Structure 1
Amino acid sequence: VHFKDGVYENIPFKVKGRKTPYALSHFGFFAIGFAVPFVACYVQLKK
């Protein structure tokens, strides 16, 4: 609980990972940036 130097671990995400080198999670962030208004329009109308 007290082993955080505070240089790169403060972010609530893991930098390590070959499947997600901050490339898949951040592309999901890209998707969800415009996802909610698009789906809100799609529920009742067309985009």
Structure 2
Amino acid sequence: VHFKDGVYENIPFKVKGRKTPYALSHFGFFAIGFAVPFVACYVQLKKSGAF
């Protein structure tokens, strides 16, 4: 059936076996999404000019 079942093996990201801390890529993956519209604001605010 060729796909390994487990508890942490239903997700496309590692948690346990890891050199970096997991909270880094957790809050990073979510903070890039939170910082999408702020980057949108920075590019548009410089394009018309004021920031």
Indicate the TM-score class for this superposition, using the shorter chain for normalisation: 0.5 to 0.7
In percent, how many aligned pairs have the same letter? Answer: 100
Please, which runs of 5 or more residues in structure 2 have no aligned partner?
Answer: none
**TM-score normalised by the chain length of structure 1:** 0.65
Count the aligned residue pairs. Answer: 47
Q: Which has the larger radius of gyration?
A: 2
**TM-score normalised by the chain length of structure 2:** 0.62
**Larger helix proportion of the pair:** 2
Root mean square deviation of aligned Cα: 2.9
Q: Which runs of 4+ in 1 moved over 6 A?
A: none
Please, which runs of 5 or more residues in structure 1 have no aligned partner?
Answer: none
